[PDB]
């Protein structure tokens, strides 16, 4: 199904984005990824509609406490 | 129970934030996390009241010696976190 | 043939990899991360398919993030690891 | 026992800070810690008075050859 | 045996430098080191003549796609270096 | 015994500094240390005279190919160092 991503500067903003994503819609948190330079990504999976709602909520909440670098929804991601 | 987080620029400010958190309330220091660009986070667990008091004290103390980037208290963290 | 796109940040890299796979008959080998936010996506296929994939991946990744470098190696040396 | 910390940009400035700390007062060098991004911390232990003297001397000496990012004395660290 | 080194800003320029080095002469790719701030080094070994040719080719090719920070050939590395 | 240190931006400049240090005087290469952000330190030990000569030569040679960030000679390091 669809993939939702939120990349923030700092771990705390990422945890807030992931918490908000799970509370907003029927999505499953796959995990976190850290590529250095403070860039932390939270990844969720679910139906396109749930993932779009999750990413929107996650971005809004994370922005309140930290910097959201990028966000993306891939409706039909290749394996 | 509740999760308390303080993210600082540099290790020394993080150690001060963690020391202040443990001294302020009945919370347990889970550990540290470092995501690069000098961003270091200290994490504690306990009842929401103890965690709120710990985070408040940790932020105030760490700010005196370094930069606090972010702080957060999650009363009931999601199972997936 | 090997196709490479290095970005600043993971999300731009995932977008570059998604665009590469959708543009031509190439296989995503994987990702590589050397820190400092530098993330590379690697694809394999015929030189024509890989050139088309890299072009499309760069164009789409640039719309959401910074593409640091891109490269097509038509015939990689065995020692390339 | 009090904890003395000096965080520098670079390892050489940190080694100079640690050498100066040990020569200034009756403190023991516990070790060095590195969190990446060139941030290196030297940690000493001893009585609060010895640790304050050590940190002051370590900062002054390290600044002559490199950048001191932060310094701290914790008179009674949590166990 | 001589040691050849090329340090680039980023992994992709480094891959290009290492690919070019192996294609240019009879050298063996030992591997790579990464020390942060995006600095990636590719290391080769062989006779001094093969290593000089490999490094020259690797630098020329890598520069076309990225930044080459430094390059070096050590004709007879010190015994203490051989540990790394 | 004296301690000699050279910290460079990049591994290659550090290897050149270490090679030059060993060739300049009767010093022993203890090893290398990397604290991130491209900062790499080469450490030698020997008599104060040999270490001063080694560091001088290492700095001059390393500067030709890269950036020397710092250099230091400690004539009498504390045992704890």
How does this model look, in words?
The structure is a homohexamer. The first copy, chain A, is an alpha+beta fold and 79 residues long. Chain A has one domain (1-79). Chain A has helices at 11-24, 48-65; strands spanning 2-9, 28-34, 39-46, 67-74. Chain A has a four-stranded antiparallel sheet with strand order 2-3-1-4, with helices on one face. Chain A is globular. The interface between E and F is medium-sized, with 21 and 23 residues. It is classed as structural protein.
Keywords, please?
39% strand, alpha+beta, globular, four-stranded antiparallel beta sheet, homohexamer, 79 residues, 41% helix
**How many helix segments of chain A?**
2
Strand portion of chain A: 35-45%
How many β-strand stretches of chain A?
4
Main sheet strand line-up of chain A: 2-3-1-4
Largest sheet of chain A: 4 strands, antiparallel
What is the terminal separation of chain A in angstroms? 10 Å
The total number of structural domains of chain A is: 1
What oligomeric arrangement do these chains adopt? Answer: homohexamer
Family (chains A, D): Belongs to the bacterial microcompartments protein family. CsoS1 subfamily.
Subcellular location (chains A, D): Bacterial microcompartment
Main location (chains A, D): other
Protein name (chains A, D): Bacterial microcompartment protein homohexamer
């Amino acid at each position: 199904d669809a993939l939702g991503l939120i990349e923030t500067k700092g771990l705390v903003a990422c945890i807030e984005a992931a918490d908000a994503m799970c509370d907003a819609a029927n999505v499953e948190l796959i995990g976190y990824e850290n590529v250095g330079s403070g860039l932390v990504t939270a990844m969720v999976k679910g139906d396109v509609g749930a993932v779009k709602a999750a990413v929107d909520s996650g971005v809004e909440s994370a922005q309140r406490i930290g910097e959201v670098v990028t966000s993306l929804v891939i409706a039909r991601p290749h394996n």
